[PDB]
């Protein structure tokens, strides 16, 4: 519900990061734009239950590294 | 009950991710569509107890890495 | 009581995952069908205390990997 | 009192798994039949404090792997 | 008080497992007989504080493996 | 107070295990006899704060293995 | 205050183990004599805060092993 | 419900006689050990509805004689 | 209604004895498993009105001796 | 009214035992199916006054032995 | 008034068994059809005081065996 | 008063069976006609104390067999 | 419940006859010692349900004569 | 509990017949002396549950005849 | 308590028949003198529980015939 | 009534020491078994008034030494 | 009740001194183990009324000196 | 109870004198150390009922002189 975070680095211009709400319904809550080279450190909270990443990006989580190729 | 997440990367167009209800009866509660190259970080919550994945995909959990080919 | 999950991947058509009821008496309360290639991440909850797996399947738990040949 | 599970795989037909009752009085409260190849993941709860396994079987616990030759 | 367990496998016929009472008074509270090849997984409970094993047996605990030759 | 245990195996006939009371006063409250080959798994409780072992025995604790020659 | 213990083995006759009182004023609370070969497993409690060991003895703690030669 | 009895003679060492309780649930109630040569005359009562005999024994009932070869 | 018994001796491993309910509707109420060579003396009670026997077995009643081969 | 029983042994697959209701009106209230070799011990009760047997069967009553060829 | 039964076996097709009512007024209250080879065990109750059998049949009672040639 | 019965088989056409009233007054209360070959099983009741049989018939009672040649 | 007796004749010095308690729990209730030649006629009572005989002895019951060779 | 008797004949001078009480405790109630040739017919009562016979005597019970040699 | 009797015939002059008191206390309650040839049919009653016979006499009981030679 | 003791030493296997109760009725209260070589120091109490010794034994009292030969 | 004592000296390893309960019921209430050479001066108390000595030992009482050889 | 004393003289360095508590529960109460040559005159009281002496010592009581060698 908290206390865990992800690290996303943008590898190209125009990377989109979307947060899905917490509750009975699942609706979009917010989105963020990242330009090439930017780093975002995001946390799981009371209003966020899922994080969706579009665009070429490098992601670090507790389970290791992954690369999105959108 | 809460505070654990899975990482799903879509390896093909049209991958389905389904969340099942938490309660006495089990029913489909929400689903998400993923495009090729896209990444979702999903958490276990107060309305979701099980997660099904349809389509070719790459999954990371606390127990390791698996690949689905449905 | 909660907060622990298993990962099941179906290696054949028609794999059955049965949940057993939590309480004084024990009975089947839910069946799940998996087709060849699908992956299910299932959690221990307030209504489930045991899980039975019939069919050829690949299972990951905190204690390691096992293969069912039912 | 809770939150610990065992993994039992039946290596031959007709394996019996018996659960003992929690309290001042200890009585047999349920048993399960396993056919050759099936897998059961079972949890310690408020009504089960001990588990007995009869028949040839393969068991995984937090302390390692054991085999019953019954 | 609870939430720990031992694994006992009987290496000969007629193995006795005795549970001693928890409290100011210390007395035999229950015992179990194990046939050859059987495996018992036993948990420390609110009514059990000590466990005595008579007969030839193989025991797994968090501190390692031991062999009783009673 | 609880949630910790020792494993004692008797290497000779007539091993004595003595449990000391918990509180302002410290007096013997119980003892147990062990024959050659027997194994006792004993827990720390609300009425026991110290344990004494007389006789040739082999002991397993969280800090390792020790042997008493008494 | 609890949940931590020391293991003392007497290597000579007449080993003294002294407990100091828990509170604002510090004084002797109890002591124990150990004969050659005996093993004592002692726990920290609500009435004991420090432990003194006089005589030749072998001590195991969470931080390692030490030998007293007084 | 009463007024009828069985006679069991032990033909070998270690014969077990088990009594099952009377009521809606059927749980074990008591067991007895017989050494080679002993005779037990047991009655049906308010807390006993079935009797189970393990081991080589010679049994006399109103319907005649039988021999268990366990 | 009460006070009559049957004697069943198992002539093979895995013999099932089933007791049916006493009431308006008839349902399975309990079952027992018997090993090769064991004898059960069962009584008619306030919750049991009929008894079914599956497996090779030898039966004694007031009316004589019969053999089942199911 | 009660306290008397019949013994039926099935000599062919699919033997039917029908119970007739006790009271002013008479109707079928229970069917029982027996496979070849099974034995049923059935008692006259507060809801059963007559018993119909269809199929090849061997029947024992207080008056002797009969064989049905239905 | 109760607790006595007759055994009727139908030796040819179309055997009729009629029960007469108990009380000051005697009237036909039920009848049964039996096909060749069928067996019926019937009891005397609070609504049946006499039984009439038409057709070729074989009857067993406490007084012996009789045959109806109807 | 009750709970005894006679068996009458008609050896010729038109056999009359008459039941006489129980009490201070004695009178015909009911009669039955039997065709050739028929069998009637009749019970002594609260309204019947004596039975008269006219016509050729074969009678079985607890005291033996008799033949009426009326 | 009551009203049935056994006859025990001691064929050697020091024969033990043990009576077990009637109720929910079973324990020793009394015992008797018999010298060579003595005869005891013992009745089933409201505080006794089972009887053990240790030693060489000759026993008479309603079901016949048996000998204990303890 | 009542209404059953034994017959004892004295075959030697000085035969002793001892009666034990009926209740929670088994305490001697009375004894009787018999000279050579005497016959005693003794019944089971509300204050008597067991009978011991010392000396050379001849005993008749419902189960047959025995001879005490003491 | 009642409904059983003995038959005593006096084979010599002066035969004594003594009745002992029924209750917690036992004492002589009555006696009868029989001359040679006389016959007495005596019953067990509410005030009598044991009977002694002194003198040469012939006795008939439910268990057979005996001869007293006092 | 109090404060006096006897000393009993067993000179043979199986010596019996019986204590008689203090009151209007002098009856057995307890017995004790002594093996060869044991010594029992027994006092006179409020529930004890007499002591019987059976078997070969050596007794010391205030009045001197005696030897029981039984 | 008090004011008297015994003196026991242990002449061998492992001498047992057992105290029996004072009252209507008699049971083991405490025991002491003596190593070779030790001396125990024991007193009769309000809770102790008899004392047993097992093992080789030397005993002094008001009546003199005795030697136990258990 | 009181008013009796024992004289102990230490014949070697380090002699231990242990006093045992008076009451239903028996447990160590106090100990005393004696060096070579020292003398202790100890009494019996309401908190002491038994006394143990470890080490080489010379003891005087009302019953005489004894020596401990421990
Ligand atoms: Co935008
Ligand atoms: Co969709
Ligand atoms: Co047991
Ligand atoms: Co089953
Ligand atoms: Co005894
Ligand atoms: Co007179
Ligand atoms: Co002990
Ligand atoms: Co000190």
Residue numbers in the entry:
A (entry chain iC), B (entry chain 5C), C (entry chain M), D (entry chain k), E (entry chain 7), F (entry chain UA), ...: 3 to 72
What do the study authors state?
TRAP has proved a useful building block for construction of artificial nanostructures. The wild‐type protein forms a ring‐shaped assembly comprising 11 identical monomers. Here, we report variants of TRAP which can assemble into TRAP‐cages mediated by Co(II) or Zn(II).
When the TRAPS33H/K35H protein was mixed with Co(II) or Zn(II), it showed the formation of pseudospherical cages with a diameter of ≈22 nm, similar to TRAP Au(I) 24‐cage. We constructured a number of cages named as follows: Cages made with Zn(II) (TRAPK35C‐Zn(II)‐cages); TRAPS33H/K35H with either Co(II) or Zn(II) (TRAPS33H/K35H‐Co(II) or ‐Zn(II)‐cages); TRAPS33H/K35C with Zn(II) (TRAPS33H/K35C‐Zn(II)‐cages). The resulting structures showed that these cages are mainly composed of 24 TRAP rings, and the overall shape and bonding network between adjacent rings is retained when compared to the TRAPAu(I) 24‐cage. In the structure of TRAPS33H/K35H‐Co(II)‐cage, every bridge has in its center one ion in close proximity to the histidine residues introduced in positions 33 and 35 as expected. However, a closer analysis revealed that the coordination geometry is unlikely to be a perfect tetrahedron but rather a distorted one or an octahedron formed by 4 histidine ligands from the protein and 2 bonds with other ligands such as water molecules (which are not visible due to limited resolution). TRAP‐cages that possess only histidine ligands, TRAPS33H/K35H‐Co(II) cages, and TRAPS33H/K35H‐Zn(II) cages, almost completely disassembled in the presence of 35 µM EDTA (1 equivalent to TRAP monomer).
